[PDB]
Each structure stands twice: as C-alpha cells, then as structure tokens.
C-alpha cells in the first residue's frame, strides 16, 4: 500500500525494445466506474499531442486513440480486457518496429499500429482512479 502521486508524470525516451511496465490497482470498486488512463505524450507541454492513449473504462471496455492538432482521432476499442475487480493489475506496454504490443495480467492484449514515431514520445502520463506501485521504463 505504498503508492505514487497520481497523475503520475515521467520523462521517457522510446525505441523499438523498451518495455513500459505499469503497476496498480483501481482506486473503486467497478460498480462506481472506475477509470484508468495511460498518455503518451510527445511534448513536455500540457496541450501537447498524444501519439498512444489507452483508457480502461474498468467493467466496461478499453479504448485506444492519439490526440492529433488537439483532435481526438480513429478510437480503436476492445470490449473485454482481464482486469479483475479490486486486484492489483500489471500492464506491459512494448514497443515494437510497428505496433506498440500491450500485455495485461500475463495475456496479450492487443497491437495498436504507430500513427506516429515512438521516438517523439516525451512524457508518459498515468492517471484517473487508480492508486499506482511503479511505472518503470526498460531499454
């Protein structure tokens, strides 16, 4: 039950091979719809645009975009992820040649195609209803 802030903001520098590990839990319980959100930011700027966004509407699905011009572009969703009501849950995030490939809880989640170079991201942000134990950076 140590914790960081939240929003959690860290600077990051992204190449094919890094790993961007998030660990937490859902600050409610799913019956008060709790919320988790991941930006990948490229600018250190607070109207900066967002290359990857995922937001876990916990219970009820996950969405993924990019905030392009101050746009929010095509959402890609999935209807169900396996997060478990009031656990604590590990997130994976890879980066690949052309697809950030995410990890949920041992299982592959999904490969969301780059709209834009991972080596633009600046700043990752995490945030929303969760109580957070680490955000870690490999490679």
Known sequence: ?????????LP???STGACVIIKGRPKLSFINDPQLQVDFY???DEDSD???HFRVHFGHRVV????EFGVWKLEEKIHYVPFEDGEPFELRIYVRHSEYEVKVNGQYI???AHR????YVKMIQVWRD???????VYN
């Open 1 to 9: 039950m140590s914790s960081l802030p939240v929003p959690y903001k």
């Open 12 to 14: 990051v520098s992204l």
């Open 42 to 44: 490229t600018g250190t």
């Open 50 to 52: 967002i290359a990857f």
């Open 64 to 67: 993924m975009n990019s905030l």
């Open 110 to 112: 999904y490969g969301f």
């Open 116 to 119: 834009h170079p991972p080596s």
């Open 130 to 136: 969760v109580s957070l134990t680490s955000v870690c």
